[PDB]
Design a protein around this ligand. Structure first.
Ligand SMILES: Cc1ncc(COP(=O)(O)O)c(C=O)c1O
Ligand SMILES: Cc1ncc(COP(=O)(O)O)c(C=O)c1O
Ligand code: NA
Ligand code: NA
Lengths: 429, 428
């Protein structure tokens, strides 16, 4: 990669949620192996974010690689209309077996946002088919479900800037963010808001959608599992669908295979993505129950009306079959337990820093929330110089490393965090 | 693959737009090479639809393979937030260069639908930054743009069954479907609808969005390029953005590199996907102008508010690069030219079949439109028994084969189509 390649990138290539007139610096990666990213100039970085961009088994994993390569020898892609293949069946068998019993019908898709769109369509088609006038979604504030329009309509209105689309996006019901912590105690006062809303709109709610236990992009919030239990029972009593969005929390991230395990409840609809392919390439899945899947197909449309071009992509399905196989061993449970301990123990000191507002850890996720917003360019440069790759945002410095990370690499990550929040050098902007 | 796998699929695996309570057989494939699909049982089928599912250089193409495997050895994926890489830069270079000049800013994404969502978002944020109250889209009937909510909002309301969501989807403006054919003459009566709508809502319209020349999933319609000429001008006069959705037409499919080339116009926003990666795996791109990209970045938000987890995926960008490099040889122009001729020539006779209403052809797209709907299960089986894979829908039997297809393979495809519409056996 030349400097001219870099100039081209800056002037012509958009990047996630970042300015094209006032763009901050980017770092050129030429390859990756194990737990490290390798930049163009040869520097190696221990990646602390890997799992959040789905790389729970690190990079250049031999099994993942062999699987992808082999499937390429057989067939990278083939359409899924009127056709089926070994990789999609192996994957759906795994998805069905590993998730709660009632989740037995799978709709494969390309991305997480689409997976949420699908869930949202399912709920609406479901009630259309049963002749009920239900088009509203009840969610929590601080939730995040993707960037496409329907997904956006259940994202927190303040965090996602709904004033930008005011009059374009449908208006859903937003109950207050869960206050009870995962670490702590349950306070029944938390329920009043959700409850008030349920009463006023019980007859028009199509589904309760939430990220279980961890609210990711909307604040790395970690709340009490009793919440899920209450929501399931309320949905049970009122006859409402519950969508659980586990695109971020699935496949071991919170210490359990699925965050809903923390409460021993099953949603009617489950969204999955990210770690699903072990972070090799995009793929997603929306699981639902026989009752929903069948009901939808018995209505006016004769089917569930959705179906992406690359649906069921064999290359991506193989990658995921290999990713789930690594999890089959069960080694991750302990890998994460140990990562969980090391994060609590090694992030604790941040509770002593002037710039810190709170610290919280759950599974492979460690968050250090700061009092003031970070300076993106300056803090990013700092981390790179420590030989680590950590990507903050807003008032959040968080880690979610590969489950395979050696204690020596995780220690380097935590020290870099602890060092970044000691004074105000890297804060504000 | 065993029969229990097949039983599992039926019972647990949803497929595109199809019932879970009354699914139709699905055929199990174990591999593919050149232009053939290889069923579990050993039967080989010539694929006639490969290019519509993005596979314009066929299957198991050596150049695409090597590139993908090489990239895998470097890295399959790495996040794009604060990071860049060669596959992403080579791709965006090629995309900027091969599209009209004003299109020089690339938002890479995962899938076509999302690419359309990106465009629509781009348009709304643009006007928002300018302080104008413009939230409606003007499109055309029989248009199809994806299955996500926003994309659905600009799809033909009849074709996509909007009543299901009546009250949830925003109500946009639908000009009538274009009547003038790509084969035929221009008729100016075609404009009145559009003009009446523009006159009444010019002040609230954020953008015009359409599929150029060919309207795919909404009817495989082939209309006159003057339409694009006219729309580009009105939008220019009124200050309105034009979005061109070339997810299905891009990369040589209509005989030009991009169907816009047929009318000699450039849109403000361009959506690409499907053949972008030579049909190996999913990827998408949305290009726009500097005026649009910058204006968005200077508004309230300070940037364009979007960013998928797998944005910029190196593996898919590698594939795409290897696919565009094949197109660089120019060989596709002659390949598609010939396929266009062979298709016109060999489907012509279907015009005389009683089950047929219209035969139209453009580039590597050949369509036989029938008078009644096809018998899905029965026709699919017929095709498979002829050793070909043809996937019809509604009243449409179409082919869109890989550009590398041999005249003999193509002829087997055209022979099957003409045979299929020869009586009502396979209809209703
Ligand atoms: C014109 C057009 N736009 C958008 C799409 C959406 O593509 P996908 O279903 O991959 O999201 C398609 C799919 O074929 C298409 O043909
Ligand atoms: C809970 C949750 N849902 C949905 C998404 C959307 O995933 P994608 O950005 O791939 O569309 C994310 C992305 O991080 C997420 O964390
Ligand atoms: Na299950
Ligand atoms: Na260009």
């Amino acid at each position: 990669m030349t400097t001219d390649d870099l100039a081209f990138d800056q002037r012509h290539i958009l990047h996630p949620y970042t300015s094209m007139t006032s763009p901050l610096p980017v770092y050129p990666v030429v390859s990756a192996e194990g737990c490290e990213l390798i930049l163009s100039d040869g520097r190696r970085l221990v990646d602390g974010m890997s799992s959040w961009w789905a790389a729970i088994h690190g990079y250049n994993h031999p099994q993942l690689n062999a699987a992808m390569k082999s499937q390429i020898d057989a067939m990278s892609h083939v359409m899924f209309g009127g056709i089926t293949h070994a990789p999609a069946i192996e994957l759906c068998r795994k998805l069905v077996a590993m998730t709660p019993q009632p989740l037995e019908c799978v709709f494969l898709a390309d991305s997480g946002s689409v997976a949420v769109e699908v869930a949202m369509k399912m709920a609406l088609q479901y009630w259309q088919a049963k002749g009920e006038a239900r088009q509203r979604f009840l969610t929590f504030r601080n939730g995040y479900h993707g960037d496409t329009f329907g997904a956006m309509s259940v994202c927190d209105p303040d965090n996602s800037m709904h004033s930008l689309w005011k009059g374009y996006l449908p208006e859903n019901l937003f109950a207050p963010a869960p206050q009870s912590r995962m670490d702590g105690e349950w306070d029944e006062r938390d329920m009043v808001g959700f409850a008030r809303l349920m009463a006023a709109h019980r007859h028009e709610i199509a589904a309760v959608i939430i990220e279980p236990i961890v609210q990711g992009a909307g604040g790395m919030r970690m709340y009490h599992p009793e919440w899920l239990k209450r929501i399931r029972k309320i949905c049970d009593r009122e006859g409402i669908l519950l969508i659980a969005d586990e695109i971020a929390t699935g496949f071991g991230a919170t210490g359990k295979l699925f965050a809903c395990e923390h409460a021993e409840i099953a949603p009617d609809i489950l969204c999955l993505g990210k770690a699903l392919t072990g972070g090799t390439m995009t793929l997603s899945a929306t699981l639902t129950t026989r009752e929903v899947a069948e009901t939808i197909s018995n209505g006016e449309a004769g089917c569930f009306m959705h179906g992406p071009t690359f649906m069921g992509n064999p290359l991506a399905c193989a990658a995921a079959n290999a990713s789930l196989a690594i999890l089959e061993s069960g080694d991750w449970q302990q890998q994460v337990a140990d990562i969980e301990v090391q994060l609590r123990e090694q992030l604790a000191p941040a509770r002593d820093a002037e710039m810190v507002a709170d610290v919280r850890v759950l599974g492979a996720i460690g968050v250090v929330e700061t009092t003031h917003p970070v300076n993106m360019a300056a803090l990013q440069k700092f981390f790179v110089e420590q030989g680590v790759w950590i990507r903050p945002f807003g008032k959040l410095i968080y880690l979610m490393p590969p489950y395979i990370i050696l204690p020596q690499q995780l220690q380097r990550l935590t020290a870099a965090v602890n060092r970044a929040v000691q004074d105000e050098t890297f804060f504000c902007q």
